Scaffold this active site. Structure first.
Site, PDB file in Angstrom:
ATOM      1  N   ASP A 133       0.825  -1.212   0.000  1.00  0.00           N
ATOM      2  CA  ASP A 133       0.000   0.000   0.000  1.00  0.00           C
ATOM      3  C   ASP A 133       0.854   1.256   0.000  1.00  0.00           C
ATOM      4  O   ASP A 133       0.586   2.209   0.736  1.00  0.00           O
ATOM      5  CB  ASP A 133      -0.961  -0.016   1.187  1.00  0.00           C
ATOM      6  CG  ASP A 133      -2.089  -1.019   1.009  1.00  0.00           C
ATOM      7  OD1 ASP A 133      -3.063  -0.704   0.288  1.00  0.00           O
ATOM      8  OD2 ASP A 133      -2.004  -2.131   1.586  1.00  0.00           O
ATOM      9  N   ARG A 137      -0.725   9.023  -0.263  1.00  0.00           N
ATOM     10  CA  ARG A 137      -1.825   9.134   0.693  1.00  0.00           C
ATOM     11  C   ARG A 137      -1.489   8.491   2.043  1.00  0.00           C
ATOM     12  O   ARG A 137      -2.130   8.796   3.050  1.00  0.00           O
ATOM     13  CB  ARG A 137      -3.127   8.513   0.120  1.00  0.00           C
ATOM     14  CG  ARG A 137      -3.050   7.009  -0.129  1.00  0.00           C
ATOM     15  CD  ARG A 137      -4.374   6.389  -0.571  1.00  0.00           C
ATOM     16  NE  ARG A 137      -4.200   4.957  -0.826  1.00  0.00           N
ATOM     17  CZ  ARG A 137      -3.825   4.449  -2.000  1.00  0.00           C
ATOM     18  NH1 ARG A 137      -3.601   5.255  -3.031  1.00  0.00           N
ATOM     19  NH2 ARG A 137      -3.666   3.142  -2.137  1.00  0.00           N
ATOM     20  N   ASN A 138      -0.484   7.607   2.055  1.00  0.00           N
ATOM     21  CA  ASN A 138      -0.124   6.849   3.264  1.00  0.00           C
ATOM     22  C   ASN A 138       1.185   7.295   3.858  1.00  0.00           C
ATOM     23  O   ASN A 138       1.710   6.664   4.778  1.00  0.00           O
ATOM     24  CB  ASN A 138      -0.084   5.347   2.965  1.00  0.00           C
ATOM     25  CG  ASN A 138      -1.442   4.800   2.601  1.00  0.00           C
ATOM     26  OD1 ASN A 138      -2.443   5.255   3.118  1.00  0.00           O
ATOM     27  ND2 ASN A 138      -1.480   3.823   1.718  1.00  0.00           N
ATOM     28  N   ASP A 151       0.696   4.274   9.653  1.00  0.00           N
ATOM     29  CA  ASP A 151       0.271   3.002  10.219  1.00  0.00           C
ATOM     30  C   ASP A 151      -0.078   2.029   9.090  1.00  0.00           C
ATOM     31  O   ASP A 151      -0.723   2.410   8.105  1.00  0.00           O
ATOM     32  CB  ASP A 151      -0.926   3.234  11.143  1.00  0.00           C
ATOM     33  CG  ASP A 151      -1.391   1.975  11.820  1.00  0.00           C
ATOM     34  OD1 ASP A 151      -0.750   1.563  12.809  1.00  0.00           O
ATOM     35  OD2 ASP A 151      -2.409   1.397  11.379  1.00  0.00           O
TER      36      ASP A 151
HETATM   37  C1  LIG Z   1      -1.645   5.911   6.569  1.00  0.00           C
HETATM   38  N1  LIG Z   1      -2.612   6.761   7.269  1.00  0.00           N
HETATM   39  C2  LIG Z   1      -2.572   6.802   8.600  1.00  0.00           C
HETATM   40  O1  LIG Z   1      -1.744   6.197   9.285  1.00  0.00           O
HETATM   41  C3  LIG Z   1      -3.644   7.692   9.247  1.00  0.00           C
HETATM   42  C4  LIG Z   1      -4.853   7.893   8.567  1.00  0.00           C
HETATM   43  C5  LIG Z   1      -5.841   8.697   9.139  1.00  0.00           C
HETATM   44  C6  LIG Z   1      -5.624   9.297  10.382  1.00  0.00           C
HETATM   45  C7  LIG Z   1      -4.427   9.087  11.052  1.00  0.00           C
HETATM   46  C8  LIG Z   1      -3.425   8.295  10.491  1.00  0.00           C
HETATM   47  N2  LIG Z   1      -2.272   8.060  11.164  1.00  0.00           N
HETATM   48  C9  LIG Z   1      -1.450   8.968  11.661  1.00  0.00           C
HETATM   49  N3  LIG Z   1      -0.349   8.547  12.328  1.00  0.00           N
HETATM   50  C10 LIG Z   1       0.496   9.433  12.825  1.00  0.00           C
HETATM   51  N4  LIG Z   1       0.279  10.730  12.672  1.00  0.00           N
HETATM   52  C11 LIG Z   1      -0.819  11.167  12.005  1.00  0.00           C
HETATM   53  N5  LIG Z   1      -1.003  12.475  11.877  1.00  0.00           N
HETATM   54  C12 LIG Z   1      -1.956  13.156  11.207  1.00  0.00           C
HETATM   55  C13 LIG Z   1      -2.677  12.674  10.099  1.00  0.00           C
HETATM   56  C14 LIG Z   1      -3.636  13.498   9.480  1.00  0.00           C
HETATM   57  O2  LIG Z   1      -4.392  13.112   8.404  1.00  0.00           O
HETATM   58  C15 LIG Z   1      -4.232  11.789   7.867  1.00  0.00           C
HETATM   59  C16 LIG Z   1      -3.873  14.795   9.955  1.00  0.00           C
HETATM   60  O3  LIG Z   1      -4.786  15.622   9.331  1.00  0.00           O
HETATM   61  C17 LIG Z   1      -6.171  15.342   9.597  1.00  0.00           C
HETATM   62  C18 LIG Z   1      -3.155  15.276  11.037  1.00  0.00           C
HETATM   63  O4  LIG Z   1      -3.396  16.564  11.454  1.00  0.00           O
HETATM   64  C19 LIG Z   1      -3.139  16.869  12.828  1.00  0.00           C
HETATM   65  C20 LIG Z   1      -2.198  14.450  11.651  1.00  0.00           C
HETATM   66  N6  LIG Z   1      -1.687  10.276  11.504  1.00  0.00           N
END
Ligand SMILES: CNC(=O)c1ccccc1Nc1ncnc(Nc2cc(OC)c(OC)c(OC)c2)n1
Length: 259
Positions: A133, A137-138, A151
């Site tokens: 993946d 976007r990730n 994650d």
């Molecule tokens: C691969 N996508 C993820 O790991 C993920 C997806 C949706 C929400 C959180 C995710 N994981 C994650 N892990 C560590 N740090 C963050 N930070 C983060 C992630 C964000 O959007 C994905 C944020 O904007 C809404 C954000 O703003 C404060 C911080 N996200």
């Protein structure tokens, strides 16, 4: 011991969601220490041992990795409602970040991100772990000069046809070399400041185009040697693609060249 006391966690705003529930930003507090910013995966209807087990397996997946460019497991709360606590990347998704900071980022920075991710992926390759993946976007932004793989549970799928290697599409084969294909796509996204690959193109026509030899074009202001490295990631035959070990080395040189 990865078990965390719930009262050490302060829940903040939601920053998205995954299969099992909402994800929140928040704070992990501990006596004598500064408040640590964290991401918190929640589970609507944990407890049910199958669902709770699947959710918690995602924490166990992240536990086995220790790398500067991969988000870290902080801990878990195994009582209802079950939470997984992760290291927060305070600047969010790489795609949004690149789209907004387009006139404030130089080429060195973009190559820096590709390089940093390649070190994470060479790390996974050495553990024989197949991501499946890899897409912009990730990827998450920890600082202007630091990105991280998100994650792995939350990374799961979009089948991401436009990112996938032909052998993954045709024969459901997923290997480090299919990951390399995806990483090539991810680099193109980065150089394009977060424009999606095969825009306007139906998923079903995508495999037809790859099989006909069509590849994503050279991004404006992308250096030739870097586009050359990208097209190698998109070799139709997986055995002709470079390993992440080689990509790391070459991205290092390309980056230095650019600086
Ligand atoms: C691969 N996508 C993820 O790991 C993920 C997806 C949706 C929400 C959180 C995710 N994981 C994650 N892990 C560590 N740090 C963050 N930070 C983060 C992630 C964000 O959007 C994905 C944020 O904007 C809404 C954000 O703003 C404060 C911080 N996200």
């Amino acid at each position: 011991d990865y078990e965390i006391q719930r009262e050490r966690i302060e829940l903040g705003r939601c920053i998205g969601e995954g299969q099992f529930g909402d994800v929140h930003q928040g704070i992990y507090m501990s006596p004598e220490n500064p408040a640590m910013a964290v991401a918190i995966k929640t589970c609507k209807n944990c407890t049910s041992d199958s669902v709770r087990e699947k959710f918690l397996q995602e924490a166990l997946t992240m536990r086995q990795f220790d790398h500067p460019h991969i988000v870290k497991l902080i801990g878990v709360i195994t009582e209802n409602p079950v939470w997984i606590i992760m290291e927060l990347c305070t600047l969010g998704e790489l795609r949004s970040f690149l789209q907004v900071r387009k006139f404030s980022l130089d080429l060195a920075s973009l190559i820096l991100y590709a390089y940093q991710l390649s070190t994470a992926l060479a790390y996974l390759e050495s553990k024989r772990f197949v991501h499946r993946d890899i897409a912009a976007r990730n990827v998450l932004v920890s600082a202007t000069d630091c990105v991280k793989l998100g994650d792995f549970g939350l990374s799961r799928y979009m089948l991401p046809i436009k990112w996938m290697a032909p052998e993954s599409i045709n024969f459901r084969r997923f290997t480090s070399a299919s990951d390399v294909w995806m990483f090539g796509v991810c680099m193109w996204e980065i150089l394009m400041h977060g424009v999606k690959p095969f825009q306007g193109v139906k998923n079903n026509d995508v495999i037809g185009r790859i099989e006909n030899g069509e590849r994503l074009p050279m991004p404006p202001n992308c250096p030739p040697t870097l586009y050359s490295l990208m097209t190698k990631c998109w070799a139709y035959d997986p055995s002709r693609r470079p390993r992440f070990t080689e990509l790391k080395a070459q991205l290092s040189t390309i980056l230095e060249e650019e600086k």
